[PDB]
C-alpha cells in the first residue's frame, strides 16, 4: 500500500547561517511534547513502517515571543523582534489586504459547520463579535493563537504548514473530553500556488504549546532534508483546514469528491512523494 510524504528543511540564512545553526544545535527539546505525542501514536509512528524516515523532535521555544510565531520566524534569526514583526503581518493580513474577505468566509464557513454539532446558530452580530476576538488575539503581543491564526500564518509565509497533534483532549480519568483542532495541513489557498514556497513548515502541538520539528540530522546540521507523512497513523489523509471558500462555489459521492479535491490541492501547493509501506 502507498503513503504520501513530503520533504522539509530549516531555513537557510544568507548571512550568519552557521551561527544560526549553532543555536539550533544547542537547542533543548520539548520533552513533554515528544513523550505525549509519541505515546499517543501521533509523532514518529512512521519510523517503523518507513525505514528511511527520521525520528522528528520538537524544539523548545526561546524568548518572550508566542511559541507559534517563534517557531515560524526562524528565517528571521538575527532580528530580536522577529516574533513581534511576524505578528504584525498576521494581524495586517486579517485586518487589511486583498484576501481578508475570502479568509473570513473560509473561517465562517468552517465555524458554521462546527456550530451545527451543537444546534447553535450565530446572528450576524455574533459573527462580527467572534471575528473581532480573532482580530484582537492577533493584535496583542504575547497572546496565544487559534486554529484559524495558523491558517492565516500560512498565507503570511506563503508556505504550507503541517501540524502534528493528537485528535482528542482527555480528562483525568483518561476518557475523551473534547477534540483538538490543530492537527493537519494548512495551505495558503488564497495565494496563487505560483507565488508560494512548496516545502512545508513542520510543527507539533501539545498542551497549549507549538514547536518546530526537526530530525537529529537537521539539528546537528549533517543533513538538510527530513520527511513528514501527509496521513495519520491509520494512513488516512490529514485534515485540510478551511479548505472551502463558499464564495468560490460549493456542493459516498460527496465524501469522495472532498478526497479528490484534497489530493489536487496538495498537488497544487506541495511536492508530494509516494512510497510503499514496509
Amino acid at each position: 500500500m502507498e503513503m504520501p510524504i513530503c520533504a522539509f528543511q530549516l531555513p537557510d540564512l544568507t548571512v550568519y547561517n552557521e551561527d544560526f545553526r549553532s543555536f539550533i544545535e544547542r537547542d533543548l527539546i520539548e520533552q513533554s511534547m515528544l513523550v505525549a505525542l509519541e505515546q499517543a501514536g501521533r509523532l514518529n509512528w512512521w519510523v517503523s513502517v518507513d525505514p528511511t524516515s527520521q525520528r522528528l523532535l520538537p524544539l523548545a521555544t526561546t524568548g518572550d515571543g508566542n511559541c507559534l510565531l517563534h517557531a515560524a520566524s526562524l528565517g528571521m534569526w538575527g532580528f530580536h523582534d522577529r516574533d513581534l514583526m511576524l505578528r504584525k503581518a498576521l494581524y495586517a493580513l486579517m485586518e487589511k489586504g486583498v484576501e481578508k474577505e475570502a479568509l473570513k468566509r473560509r473561517w465562517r464557513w468552517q465555524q458554521t459547520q462546527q456550530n451545527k454539532e451543537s444546534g447553535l446558530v450565530y446572528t450576524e452580530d455574533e459573527w462580527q463579535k467572534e471575528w473581532n476576538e480573532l482580530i484582537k488575539l492577533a493584535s496583542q503581543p504575547g497572546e496565544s493563537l487559534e486554529e484559524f491564526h495558523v491558517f492565516v500564518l500560512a498565507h503570511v509565509l506563503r508556505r504550507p504548514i503541517v501540524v502534528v497533534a493528537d485528535t482528542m483532549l482527555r480528562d483525568s480519568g483518561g476518557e475523551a473530553f473534547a477534540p483538538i483542532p490543530f492537527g493537519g495541513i494548512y495551505l495558503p489557498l488564497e495565494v496563487p500556488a505560483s507565488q508560494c514556497h512548496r516545502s512545508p513548515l513542520v510543527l507539533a502541538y501539545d498542551q497549549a504549546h507549538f514547536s518546530a520539528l526537526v530530525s537529529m540530522e537537521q539539528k546537528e546540521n549533517t543533513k538538510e532534508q527530513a520527511v513528514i507523512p501527509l496521513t495519520d497513523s491509520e494512513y488516512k489523509l490529514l485534515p485540510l483546514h478551511f479548505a472551502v471558500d463558499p464564495g468560490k462555489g460549493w456542493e459516498l459521492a460527496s465524501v469522495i469528491l472532498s478526497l479528490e479535491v484534497k489530493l489536487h490541492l496538495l498537488h497544487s501547493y506541495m511536492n508530494v512523494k509516494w512510497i510503499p509501506l514496509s
Binding site: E146, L169, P181
Partner: protein, 76 residues
C-alpha cells in the same frame, strides 16, 4: 443547586452553582475541574451561546439542567 455540563464527546460534568452566578463564574468552575481557561470556553444552552456577563437565571437554567461546552483552544 447542581447543573451538568456536556462536551461534544458526551463527557459530562457536574457543577455546584446558584442561579445568581454569572456565566464567567461557571466557566471558572469548569477550569477548576478541567483546567481549560474561561476565554477558551463557550457555553451553549437551548441553542444559544451564553454571554459571560449574564447570570444562569437570565437563561432559565435550573437544577439538573444540562449546558453544552465547546472549546476554542489556543497555543502559546
Amino acid at each position: 443547586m447542581q447543573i451538568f455540563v456536556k462536551t461534544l464527546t458526551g463527557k459530562t460534568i457536574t457543577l455546584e452553582v446558584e442561579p445568581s452566578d454569572t456565566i464567567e463564574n461557571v466557566k471558572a468552575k469548569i477550569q477548576d475541574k478541567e483546567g481549560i481557561p474561561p476565554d477558551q470556553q463557550r457555553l451553549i444552552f437551548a441553542g444559544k451561546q451564553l454571554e459571560d456577563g449574564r447570570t444562569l437565571s437570565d437563561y432559565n437554567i435550573q437544577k439538573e439542567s444540562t449546558l453544552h461546552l465547546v472549546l476554542r483552544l489556543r497555543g502559546x
